[PDB]
Amino acid sequence: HWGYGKHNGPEHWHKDFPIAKGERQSPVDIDTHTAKYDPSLKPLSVSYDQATSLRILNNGHAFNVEFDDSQDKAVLKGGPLDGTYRLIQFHFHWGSLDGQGSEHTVDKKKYAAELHLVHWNTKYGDFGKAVQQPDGLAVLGIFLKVGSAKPGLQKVVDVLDSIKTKGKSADFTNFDPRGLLPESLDYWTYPGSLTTPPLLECVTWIVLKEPISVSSEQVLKFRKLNFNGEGEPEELMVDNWRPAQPLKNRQIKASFK
């Protein structure tokens, strides 16, 4: 099945998921000089005060921190978005080395990692229906660079030993995703896709300009996870990123001058 190896990685996905070569695939390179300021975008509204985290799961390609999405508790609105989008999970993509790991790039620069906060449009009732719509999802993407530790990440890092291998989960209640956000909500936005199979073209991407800093020790713990299940040959979960895809007939808009 699909993965991030030589024989099953991004360059192979199109065989099972032909939409991999589609018109609105993600990630993309953000060419900061060609993005255009769009004065009519609104400020984003990230309303995470009532968020209810439930669980953390190693799904074999990343780890997901899952939320209760059965009410409007942690929602994204505004910006480019019409309506209300509920947080369902967040996860990261990261590298084997500090010089790669992000999915989006900025003027071809790769960050050490990228956080994706995944939200679905409440007008479609559930996640599974939302991913079949062109405006079904809103993903907030946040770059990670290595430097100072991110205090609000530490609780995530410290549970990773309990979910080392594929299929393991752990209770993960009372985690506050506000502690993963940078100071500024300045962003770029464009229409795109899921970055993992099935690669559905259902996402309004909102990529923050300001990275967060995490420590070497924090990213090193990400790199101790495994792609494999327990009792299978160990393969470190690193380099779980899809590279930049062609922009095609899209324009990236900026919320800021």
Residue 105 labeled ligand binder:
no
Q: Are the beta carbons of 192 and 206 closer than 8 angstroms?
A: no
Q: How far apart are CA 184 and CA 255, in angstroms?
A: 11
**Residues linked to residue 86 through DSSP beta bridges, in sequence order:** 75, 120
Question: Which C-beta is closer to Zn ion: that of 74 or that of 207?
Answer: 207
- Backbone phi, then psi, for 189, in 5-degree steps? -140, 145
Instruction: Give the nearer residue to Zn ion in terms of CB position, either 150 or 242.
Output: 242
Q: Which residue is nearest to Zn ion (CB)?
A: 116
- Do the Cβ atoms of 65 and 53 come closer than 8 Å? yes
Active site residue 61: yes
242 φ/ψ sector (left φ>0, alpha ψ -120 to 50, else beta) = beta
Q: Please report, as a single letter, which amino acid is at residue 17.
A: F
| CB of 213 closer than 8 Å to CB of 147 | yes
Q: Which is nearer to Zn ion, 116 or 221 (CB)?
A: 116
Q: Decide whether 175 or 241 has the Cβ nearer to Zn ion.
A: 241
Q: Tell me, residue by residue from 67 to 106, as one string, x for binding to Zn ion by CB under 5 A and - for no binding.
A: ----------------------------------------
Smallest separation, CB 37 to Zn ion (Å): 26
CB 94 within 8 A of CB 112: yes
Select from 86, 110, 116, 209 the one that contacts Zn ion (CB under 5 A).
Answer: 116
Alpha-carbon span 205 to 129, nearest angstrom: 18
Residue from 1, 61, 104, 119 carrying the catalytic annotation:
61
Of 7-15, 116-124, 165-173, 247-255, the segment contacting Zn ion by CB under 5 A is 116-124
Q: Is 119 in the site for Zn ion (CB under 5 A)?
A: no
CB of 39 to Zn ion, least distance (A): 30
Cα-flanking dihedrals φ and ψ of residue 126, to 5°? -150, 165
Q: How many residues bind to Zn ion according to rule CB under 5 A?
A: 1
| Residues annotated catalytic, as ranges | 61
Sites of contact with Zn ion (CB under 5 A)? 116
Binding residues for Zn(2+), by number, are 91, 93, 116
